[PDB]
Design a protein around this ligand. Structure first.
Ligand SMILES: Nc1nc2c(ncn2[C@@H]2O[C@H](COP(=O)(O)O)[C@@H](O)[C@H]2O)c(=O)[nH]1
Ligand SMILES: Nc1nc2c(ncn2[C@@H]2O[C@H](COP(=O)(O)O)[C@@H](O)[C@H]2O)c(=O)[nH]1
Ligand SMILES: [Mn+2]
Ligand code: NA
Length: 254
């Protein structure tokens, strides 16, 4: 076989699909947004998670077309159900580094925003802190244009990589996402308490929103809310779900 060929074939057959993981307010309430996560519905193997295929997709140069197809599918999925979403509903996408050197991301974003009434949603792009994006005049231009569209920038897996304050102002960062490994250590390791608290400290100093990822227990939720964490995500809040389950739950919240 050829795994590159097989990714191309999967893309042509629309086998990459969105799952939706909800975000809720630190102090509780109805969902204020979703993170969109790629799944591969494989004809044989079933539903495959992205750690099994995204790195190959990056090596092969296919991640950008796969991301575009996801964003288009989200527009067709949630575009006609805006009234189920309270205003300011966040929709987040993980963006690969190569996509951030490409001015076509601006068009991908404008197209997704065009599928909802104006200002109804807030589109969030998540860039992992692990690979820190090298700046150029192209990235300066791209991020100015995204900002002017109303797109927000979140730095994902925060606390695991090595970014600086100066880099946070460069790319106009709106939000830090606390890596789930730090959240897993709450009520256990003392070191990570100081790390977590230092992430919270930085977000206050810079006036940034903060999402904790990986909130699995009530003890985690309560520790994080006592520290002002804006938004919570994790299995306690809701596992990544297909559209049908997302719509179900949004109808209940009303
Ligand atoms: N580039 C990229 N990464 C994704 C996408 N969906 C999920 N990931 C990443 O894959 C990893 C595993 O996610 P889960 O198995 O849903 C996470 O770090 C997540 O951010 C996507 O559409 N694009
Ligand atoms: N074990 C575990 N994984 C989670 C939890 N919440 C989200 N995930 C997974 O973490 C990944 C999201 O990571 P990113 O922050 O890198 O997008 C997805 O694969 C998602 O399914 C959680 O509470 N526990
Ligand atoms: Mn993410
Ligand atoms: Na990520």
């Amino acid at each position: 076989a050829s795994p590159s060929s097989e990714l191309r074939r999967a893309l042509e057959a629309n086998e990459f699909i969105p799952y939706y993981q909800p975000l809720s307010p630190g102090q509780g309430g109805r969902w204020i947004g979703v993170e969109v996560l790629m799944r591969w519905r494989h004809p044989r193997e079933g539903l495959i998670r992205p750690d099994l295929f995204i790195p190959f997709a990056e090596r092969s140069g296919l991640i950008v077309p796969m991301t575009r197809a996801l964003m288009r599918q989200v527009a067709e999925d949630l575009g006609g159900h805006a009234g189920k979403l309270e205003p300011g509903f966040h929709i987040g996408f993980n963006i690969s580094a190569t996509h951030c050197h490409e001015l076509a991301l601006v068009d991908d974003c404008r197209e997704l925003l065009a599928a909802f009434p104006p200002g109804h949603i807030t589109l969030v792009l998540e860039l992992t802190e692990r690979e820190l994006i090298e700046s150029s005049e192209v990235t300066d231009r791209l991020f100015d244009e995204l900002h002017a569209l109303g797109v927000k920038i979140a730095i994902d897996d925060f606390g695991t990589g090595h970014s600086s304050l100066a880099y946070l102002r460069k790319f106009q960062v709106d939000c830090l996402k606390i890596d789930q490994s730090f959240v897993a250590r709450i009520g256990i390791d003392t070191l990570s308490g100081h790390i977590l608290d230092s992430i919270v400290e930085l977000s206050a100093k810079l006036d940034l929103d903060i999402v904790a990822e990986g909130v699995e227990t009530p003890e985690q939720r309560d520790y994080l809310a006592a520290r002002g964490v804006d938004y919570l995500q994790g299995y306690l809040i809701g596992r990544p779900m297909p559209l049908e389950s997302l719509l179900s739950s949004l109808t209940v919240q009303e």
